């Protein structure tokens, strides 16, 4: 049974390995189906427990990842794709 | 630059710590605000890389956490609250 302090510290706004669908992050790229179709990205998650504030990134960077980009009825080929990561996170006024 | 196998193997369907909103998990608790508002739960996360399959739990288990339960314009008190956890995740069809 998880003591309140521990719940609080672990849920509070911070960068966390999130699994993010490639098609969400690249809305327009329609001629491809991705394998894996999702990737591990460091993104801000959690809560600020304060009506005025919200969890948002304050330092961002990119990471490039080999992805099998499959073109239906055609073929497939490895290729690089870049994605936004969050290095730092803070609770800021809305 | 993350090599293919590395990405696939790290985004494959598995239990990942996931920050989940308490209100979403308990829609019936209209008269409380929660502090923290979200909790870290292990939950099925990734993708299965096939549209014949889907990421689902095969082994569940509950964990109790201490949540601070605010009744708006009234008061607040600490309380225990149970949440569902995914212990083993596997790739299934419909």
């Amino acid at each position, epitope marked *: 049974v998880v003591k309140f302090m521990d719940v609080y510290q672990r849920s509070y706004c911070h960068p966390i390995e999130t699994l993010v669908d490639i098609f969400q992050e690249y809305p327009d790229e329609i001629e491809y189906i991705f394998k894996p179709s999702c990737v591990p990205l460091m993104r801000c998650g959690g809560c600020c427990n304060d009506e005025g504030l919200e969890c948002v990134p304050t330092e961002e960077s990119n990471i490039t990842m*080999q992805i099998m980009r*499959i073109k239906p009825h*055609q*073929g*497939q080929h490895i290729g690089e794709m870049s994605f936004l990561q969050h290095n730092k996170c803070e609770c800021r006024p809305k | 630059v993350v090599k293919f196998m590395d990405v696939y193997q790290r985004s494959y369907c598995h239990p990942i710590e996931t920050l989940v909103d308490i209100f979403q998990e308990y829609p019936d608790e209209i008269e409380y605000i929660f502090k923290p508002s979200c909790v870290p739960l292990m939950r099925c996360g990734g993708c299965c890389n096939d549209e014949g399959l889907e990421c689902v739990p095969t082994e569940e288990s509950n964990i109790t956490m201490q949540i601070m339960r605010i009744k708006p314009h009234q008061g607040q008190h600490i309380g225990e609250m149970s949440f569902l956890q995914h212990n083993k995740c596997e790739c299934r069809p419909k």
Partner: antibody
Amino acid sequence: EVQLVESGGGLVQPGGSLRLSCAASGFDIYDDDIHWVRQAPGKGLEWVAYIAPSYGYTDYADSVKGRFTISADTSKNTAYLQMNSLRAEDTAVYYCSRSSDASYSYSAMDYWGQGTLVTVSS
Amino acid sequence: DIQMTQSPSSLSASVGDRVTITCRASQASYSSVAWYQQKPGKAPKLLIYAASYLYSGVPSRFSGSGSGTDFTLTISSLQPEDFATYYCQSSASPATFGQGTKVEIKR
């Protein structure tokens, strides 16, 4: 014009090793898709391995994983196949081939060597 | 591996015929195919990739069709040159071959 020339075939005895070479001219193997397809006598084509050297990515058929190793030396515009732990049924003409970028497909094998016989027998 | 069955395994036609080779694949519906020709004592030569697309230099007499699971090669008017063994191949991982379909001449 594009050329793919194999060598290093010959005798091997069971549980022994032998490296296969593939000398490429007319194109840069580092940015390319190189394959090895083999074929036992009287029998059909089996795909055996694949490299995209600039991606550092290799794939193999399940019938050779653990034993075989495709690689490439950029400086020698040559690809290799290290074959270890060879049983008798690995006896085959071994082609090296490529898929050029005329096909998006990584596996639409477009140019080919003349092949090289490898006999595994005691 | 992945399984690739070819039907028929062998054949017997004459010059001028219509020919149809089928190809079965244990692969996703989005995964495509290639077609090769191989004559005795020689290397194969790519005919068609991406199911339907004519690799340059290949006579129009050849064309392709099908998708996902099942695939059909088609020679409209068979020629003396067209007597060979024809293989199909997955364009996925692994990129496994079919077992080959021999066209022998009819006497």
